[PDB]
Specification:
This is part of a larger assembly, with chains A and B. Chain A is of the alpha+beta class. Helix content of chain A is 24%, strand content 8%. Chain A is built from one helix and two strands. Chain A has a two-stranded antiparallel sheet. Helix content of chain B is 0%, strand content 0%. In chain B, 0% of the residues are buried. Classes of the chains: A alpha+beta, B little secondary structure. At the A-B interface, loops of A face loops of B. Chain B: This is Minor capsid protein P30.
Amino acid sequence: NAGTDINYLSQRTANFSDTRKLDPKTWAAQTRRRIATDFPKGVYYCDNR
Amino acid sequence: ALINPQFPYAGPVPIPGPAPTETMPLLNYRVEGRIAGIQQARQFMPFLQGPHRAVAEQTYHAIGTGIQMGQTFNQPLINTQEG
């Protein structure tokens, strides 16, 4: 599914502190900045280069 | 920073803070690394080290040979003027 089955995604460290807790469309927005489009349905990407 | 009396900025973040974790530890890395493949002394290239000629000069060899031979015709005798 295209994000509709997810509330949010995030990367979290040992203190419960989220560095990027985002709703699916906003998460996808960050990816659009990286590959100029979206990955296929249900595929989520995170850049930590 | 500005502090305004009577609403003063708390004098600290106080003791009510929520310690969220004890994950503070970076476990030291211990490792042994070996890069040991047999090395062979040589690499192949198309060309290394050459300073190729952009133009050469003209170059040559040499020869001569023959003898001294001749057919001749002479001017006639003339009356001598003076002396």
